[PDB]
């Protein structure tokens, strides 16, 4: 895989960990929708995730369409991951109350109102900008195993 | 009911008819989500509708939360109606292919790229502005019978 792609997986991986450790990681569609309605101005990155077990989920795809429309109109960087388990493992760092019931959508906000100069976030911001240039608005990232 | 409220029902009723006649009325969540992703800049009004038959529909409420978050962040006037049948009758003007499968969400866009100086639209725009002042972001309108 490309250096850019490998760099994306690492950057997203790192971004997920730092965010959950800083308590600025929102998990699940329901919770993400609340945040987009309550405090959108502080959202800095969005990850949509689904797998073969989700194919045929109409409501979920509508959610992805709505979440994508929002992030794009608000200049929120958004990517997609297809390895839900790999994602569950990463996000599943703290004391899971069983297993993050829903990881189909993940939002990351900045702890402070001002910008969050996180290197991984800037790395992804450039990665998305590049995919956007070829009209790939919700590019997929392959998380490092 | 208040003059303002009665004026809202009439304005929304009129707005619905003019819009469907001008082919700038999008019906249903799926179609509305597509439009918000394809051409949001031309959406001028949003109506969410549901009834007792929808209580317990989780996916639908998430849709309402996402649609509301979008319209609000984009300054799209949004209201809600609880009389689905009354709404079906109004929207059901043309040759229905059975019955508008989904009227839970309705979008209205302006025929031209420029503003749409429709009197009913301006009437509702003021009605929403007033409800917004008392933090009522998705106010309900009672359609005239």
Swiss-Prot record, chains A, B:
<protein>
    <recommendedName>
        <fullName>Growth arrest and DNA damage-inducible protein GADD45 gamma</fullName>
    </recommendedName>
</protein>
<dbReference type="GO" id="GO:0005737">
    <property type="term" value="C:cytoplasm"/>
</dbReference>
<comment type="function">
    <text>Involved in the regulation of growth and apoptosis. Mediates activation of stress-responsive MTK1/MEKK4 MAPKKK.</text>
</comment>
<dbReference type="GO" id="GO:0046330">
    <property type="term" value="P:positive regulation of JNK cascade"/>
</dbReference>
<dbReference type="GO" id="GO:0120162">
    <property type="term" value="P:positive regulation of cold-induced thermogenesis"/>
</dbReference>
<dbReference type="Pfam" id="PF01248">
    <property type="entry name" value="Ribosomal_L7Ae"/>
</dbReference>
<dbReference type="GO" id="GO:0006915">
    <property type="term" value="P:apoptotic process"/>
</dbReference>
<keyword id="KW-0217">Developmental protein</keyword>
<dbReference type="GO" id="GO:1900745">
    <property type="term" value="P:positive regulation of p38MAPK cascade"/>
</dbReference>
<dbReference type="GO" id="GO:0030154">
    <property type="term" value="P:cell differentiation"/>
</dbReference>
<dbReference type="InterPro" id="IPR029064">
    <property type="entry name" value="Ribosomal_eL30-like_sf"/>
</dbReference>
<dbReference type="GO" id="GO:0043065">
    <property type="term" value="P:positive regulation of apoptotic process"/>
</dbReference>
<keyword id="KW-0221">Differentiation</keyword>
<comment type="similarity">
    <text>Belongs to the GADD45 family.</text>
</comment>
<comment type="subunit">
    <text>Undergoes concentration-dependent homodimerization, which is required for growth inhibititory activity and enhances interaction with PCNA. Interacts with GADD45GIP1. Interacts with PCNA.</text>
</comment>
<keyword id="KW-0053">Apoptosis</keyword>
<dbReference type="GO" id="GO:0051726">
    <property type="term" value="P:regulation of cell cycle"/>
</dbReference>
<dbReference type="InterPro" id="IPR004038">
    <property type="entry name" value="Ribosomal_eL8/eL30/eS12/Gad45"/>
</dbReference>
<dbReference type="GO" id="GO:0005634">
    <property type="term" value="C:nucleus"/>
</dbReference>
<feature type="region of interest" description="Homodimerization">
    <location>
        <begin position="29"/>
        <end position="72"/>
    </location>
</feature>
<dbReference type="InterPro" id="IPR024824">
    <property type="entry name" value="GADD45"/>
</dbReference>
């Amino acid at each position: 895989s490309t250096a850019r792609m490998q760099g994306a997986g690492k950057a997203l991986h790192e971004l997920l960990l730092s965010a959950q450790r800083q308590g600025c990681l929102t998990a699940g569609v329901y919770e993400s929708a609340k945040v987009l309605n309550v405090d959108p101005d502080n959202v800095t990155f969005c990850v949509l995730a689904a797998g073969e077990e989700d194919e045929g989920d109409i409501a979920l795809q509508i959610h992805f369409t709505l979440i994508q429309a929002f992030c794009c109109e608000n200049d929120i960087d958004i990517v997609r991951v297809g390895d839900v388990q790999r994602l569950a493992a990463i996000v599943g760092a703290g004391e899971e109350a069983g297993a993050p019931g829903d990881l189909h959508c993940i939002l990351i906000s900045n702890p402070n109102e001002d910008a969050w100069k996180d290197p991984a976030l800037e790395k992804l911001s450039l990665f998305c900008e590049e995919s956007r240039s070829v009209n790939d608005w919700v590019p997929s990232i392959t998380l490092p195993e």
